[PDB]
Design a protein around this ligand. Sequence first.
Ligand SMILES: */C=C\C1=C(C)C(=O)N/C1=C\c1[nH]c(Cc2[nH]c(/C=C3\NC(=O)C(C=C)=C3C)c(C)c2CCC(=O)O)c(CCC(=O)O)c1C
Ligand SMILES: */C=C\C1=C(C)C(=O)N/C1=C\c1[nH]c(Cc2[nH]c(/C=C3\NC(=O)C(C=C)=C3C)c(C)c2CCC(=O)O)c(CCC(=O)O)c1C
Lengths: 505, 505
Amino acid sequence: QEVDLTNCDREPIHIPGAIQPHGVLLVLSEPGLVLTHASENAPAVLGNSAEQLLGAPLGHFIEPSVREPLEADLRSARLKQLNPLKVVWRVDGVDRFFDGIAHRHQGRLILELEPSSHREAVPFLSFFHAVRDGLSRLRDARDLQELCEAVVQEVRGLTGFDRAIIYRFDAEWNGSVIAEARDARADPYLGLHFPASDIPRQARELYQLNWLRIIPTIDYQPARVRALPGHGEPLDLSFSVLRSVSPIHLEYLHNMGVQASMSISLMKDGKLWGLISCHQVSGTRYVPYEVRTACEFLGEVMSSLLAAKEGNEDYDQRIRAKSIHAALLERMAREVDFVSGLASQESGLLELVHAHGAAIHFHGRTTVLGQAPSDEALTGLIEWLGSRTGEGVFCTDRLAREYPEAQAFQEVAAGLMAFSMSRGRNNFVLWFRPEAVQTVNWSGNPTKAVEFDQGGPRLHPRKSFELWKETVRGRCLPWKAYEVEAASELRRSIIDVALQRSEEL
Amino acid sequence: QEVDLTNCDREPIHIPGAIQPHGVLLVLSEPGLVLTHASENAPAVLGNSAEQLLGAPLGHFIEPSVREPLEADLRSARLKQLNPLKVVWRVDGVDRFFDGIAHRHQGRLILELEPSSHREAVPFLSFFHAVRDGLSRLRDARDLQELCEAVVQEVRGLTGFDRAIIYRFDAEWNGSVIAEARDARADPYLGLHFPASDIPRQARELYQLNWLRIIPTIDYQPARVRALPGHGEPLDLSFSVLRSVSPIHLEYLHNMGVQASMSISLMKDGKLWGLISCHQVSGTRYVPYEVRTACEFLGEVMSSLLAAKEGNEDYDQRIRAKSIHAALLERMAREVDFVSGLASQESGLLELVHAHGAAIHFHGRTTVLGQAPSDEALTGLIEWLGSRTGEGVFCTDRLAREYPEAQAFQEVAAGLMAFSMSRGRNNFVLWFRPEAVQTVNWSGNPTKAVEFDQGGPRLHPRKSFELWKETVRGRCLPWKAYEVEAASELRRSIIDVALQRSEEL
Ligand SMILES: */C=C\C1=C(C)C(=O)N/C1=C\c1[nH]c(Cc2[nH]c(/C=C3\NC(=O)C(C=C)=C3C)c(C)c2CCC(=O)O)c(CCC(=O)O)c1C
Ligand SMILES: */C=C\C1=C(C)C(=O)N/C1=C\c1[nH]c(Cc2[nH]c(/C=C3\NC(=O)C(C=C)=C3C)c(C)c2CCC(=O)O)c(CCC(=O)O)c1C
C-alpha cells in the first residue's frame, strides 16, 4: 500500500467555497465573460451586490475605455504571462482600480481582484534591487548556505517581513529551518525541526502544483462565493490566490505568535524540496501581487540553482568505492568459491557502503562477518527479506520502521542495506551500520504536535513551539547517494562471476 | 598532445592592449583610488583625455554624492554581485551615467564604463516578466530540442538580435547549428556545420572560463589601453567586456555578412558544450549589460538542464523500446533456450535498436537474424581485445575504422552495436546497420579556412559561406542513445536469465 495517511492528511483544503475577503473572486463564462460566480464581499469591495453581478457580463461593469484590453486578454491563451490585469471598475460614474489575476483550472476562468490604489506598495527602487541584485546574489553563491541566506535576506528586504526562513524537508517530511533573516523582535526559529504534520500531505501536494501563497491577516470572516443555479458543485480553488485557508492552520499561526504569512514552494527534480516561509508577528501584510511574484521568482531561481551548489558533493569517495569495488570484483573473479572470496574481504566489503557489519546467506548457510551480531536474531531477519520484495537494493536508516523487530537488536545501529544475489531470491547480502545518536532541536513537543477538543474529536495545533530536545536512537547516518549504486554494482558483479563460474561448469 | 592546432591557436587574444571604443576601460590602483591604465577613447565617450585621467584618482571625476558609495563597492571582495555599478560621471558640470562593470584578474582591478539609460518602472517590469517567463519555459522544456527552441526565442526576445542560434560542438570541436530564432528576413542558418578552426582552442579555452562576449559592431577602431610609466607591460584582458577581439574574427563576421555579435558559453560536465550565438545582419546591437547577463543566466540554466532534458529525448521511441524489451524478456521465459526466445521475435530484437541484422554467438554457435556479413562472421567475432567491449556495449557507425576488414561488408554492416554476455567473452550479441550515404551541409568548403595571406605568412578566413555538401561514405545512420541504452538493459537481462538457467542445472 506504500503510504499511509493520517487525520490531517484528509481535509479537502481546495474547495472551501470561500475566499479571503480583501479581494473579490469572480468566474467568467467563456466566451461571454458573463459572471457565473461572485463572492459575497462584492458590495464591500466593488460596490455591487452579488445579485447584480450574476448572469451579467463583465464588460457591463468596466469603465468603457479599458474594456478592449481586459476582454482581449481574458480570452488570450497566454494569460498566465499577462497577470496582473489592469482592472478599472466603474459604478455610477466613479472608478476603482484592481490587480486582476486570472487563471483557468478544471474548465473555469477565474478572475480575482485585489484593491490596488490605496495600497501598502513598495518603492520601485527596492523592487529593482531585490530582483536585479537578488538574481546576482543567488548566481554568485558559493555554497548552499550562501544561496539560502541570500534568498531570505533579499525576501525580507523586499517584503519587510519580520521573519523569513528557508525550511528544508527531509526524507520523512519533517522540516528544519536551515536559514533565517529577521527583525530582532521575532524569536529565532533557526535550527528548529518541525513535525511532518505542520504541512500535511494534501497541503504538500498542493504546494507542488501551486507555488505561491499569502495569508494577509489570519483574522477574517471567509467570503462565500455565490453562483447562479446550474453551478452548485464546489468550485476548485487550488490556484486561487484568494482561497480561504484551513482554519486550523490559522489556529497554528496564532499559537506561533504570527499575524500574517507568505510562503513559496522550493522545487528539485519535480518534488517539493523546501519552503520560503515569511512571518509578520503583529500587523497584517497585504503584499501586492507584483512584489509576491518577485518573491516567487527568487524562489524559482534558487530552486534551479540547488544542484549546482548543493552539489558541494563529496568528490571522493565515489572514485575509491569504484576502486574498492574493482578490488572486490577482482578477488571474487579468482576464487572458484567467490562467496568465501568476498567474505575474506572484510574491510573492502564493509567500507564499500561504510557498513560496520555484513552478512552473506548462500546455499544454506549464513556467514556473518562484521560486528553486528544478532545471529540468532538474523535468521529471522534474512527471510523476512525473503518475503514480499527486497528488490533491488533494500535501504533504510531505521530498520525499526519497516521491521521493528530490530528495535531489540543493536537496532539500525546494526543498519541495513541489502539485496538478493540470484533472483531465485534466497542468496542474500546484508550490510550493518552503527548508530548516530544526535540531539535534535524541536519546536515544541513532537510527541504531541496535535491536540484534541473537549470531549471533542476536532483537532487543534500545539500551543507550545519552544525548544524541546529529543534524542534519537534507531536512526543512523543517511545512506548517501553513492552508497546504493555501489551496492547495485556489487550485485551486478556477483551475478557476472557467478555466471562465469558456471560457464566453467 | 591531443590537439594538434593548425594555424590559429597562437594569437594571444587576451593581451591586445585595445578595447571596443563604445565603452571605456579603466584600471584602478588598490587600496582604492588612482588610475594606472585607461583607453584612449575616453574623450569621445567620457569627455576627458586619457592624459588627464591617468595618474589621478577615480573620485576626481565622480559626482561627489555618488563618490563614496561607489568606492565602497570597488573595494568589495565579490564585485560580481554588484555589477553593474552606478557610475555618475561629472564632466564640466554635467552628469553622464554609466554602467560600471568591475572585476579583478591578476592582481589588477578593472572598471569598464558603458553608457547607461537610467531605469524606469514600466520597462523594468516588462523585462523582469520576460526573464521570469523565460526561466520557467526552460524548466518546463520536454526535451533538448524544446529546451534549445525556448532558449533561442528567449534570448532573441530580450536582445532583439536578428539571429539567435544554438551552436553545438561535436567530438572534433566542429560545430552544428541545431536550433534558431530569427527575423525571417535573415538567411536561416538552421542545420549548417562549421569547422573547428572557426573557434580556435585558445578561444574555447577562453570561453570555458568567461561565458559571455559581445561585439556590438564589427567595424570599429581599437582604442588602445594606455598606462602610467611603470605599468607598460601587457594588460590581461580575458574577463573584460570591452577587450578588443582578434581582427581575423572580425573579417570572418564581415565575410559571413554579420554586423554585430553576441555569444554565451554552454557547459556540460565542466567542458564547453556549445554556445548561444546571436548576430545582427545589418545594423548594430549595443545590448545593455543587465540584459546581457540575464541572457547569460538563461544560458547557465540551460547548461544545468542539458543532461536531464537530453535524457528525455525520443520519449516515445523509449516507450516502444521498453515494451519491446518487456516482450523479449517474457518470450525468453517459456524457453530454457533463451537464445531462440530472442530468435522468434527477431523482428522485435531488430526493432529494439533499429537494426536490419543481428547475430547471437552462444556456446560456440552463431544464429543469424537479419542481413548479416558472410558466414565468416567469425570476422569481428574473434577479432577484438583492447576496445572492443572489455564491457559493456560497443557501439560504432564506422566499423571499417576500428576493424578494417568490414570495408568488404559495409553494404550490410558499416555499424555495429555489440556486447559480450560473460566475463569469459565467448558469447556476444551483435546488431548490424548498413552503410547510409548521408550528406552533410557545411558552411563553405571546410578544407580551406587553414588559409594564408599573399601567400605571405599571415592568416585569413574563408570568403564564401554558401552551402557546401560533403558526401561522407562508410557510415550507418548514427546510433541513438536510447538505443545504446536499450542494448545495455537487454544485455544485463540476458545475463540474469543466463545465470538462472545454468545456475539451476
Ligand atoms: C493536522 C492538522 C495540522 C496540524 C496539527 C499542524 O500543525 N498543521 C495542520 C494542518 C495544515 N498546515 C497548513 C499549511 C502550512 N503549514 C505551514 C508550516 C510551517 N510554517 C513555518 O514557518 C514553519 C517553520 C518555520 C512550518 C513548519 C506552512 C508554511 C503552511 C502554508 C500556509 C502558510 O504559509 O502559512 C495547511 C494548509 C493551509 C492551506 O493551504 O489552506 C493545513 C491543513
Ligand atoms: C585561424 C583563425 C580563425 C579562422 C580560420 C576562423 O574562421 N576564425 C578564427 C579565429 C577566431 N574566431 C573567434 C571567435 C568566434 N568565432 C565564432 C564562430 C562562429 N559564430 C557563429 O555564429 C557560428 C555559426 C553559427 C560560428 C562558427 C564565434 C561565436 C566566436 C565567439 C565570438 C562571437 O560570438 O562573435 C576568435 C576569438 C576572438 C576573441 O575572443 O577575441 C578567434 C581567434
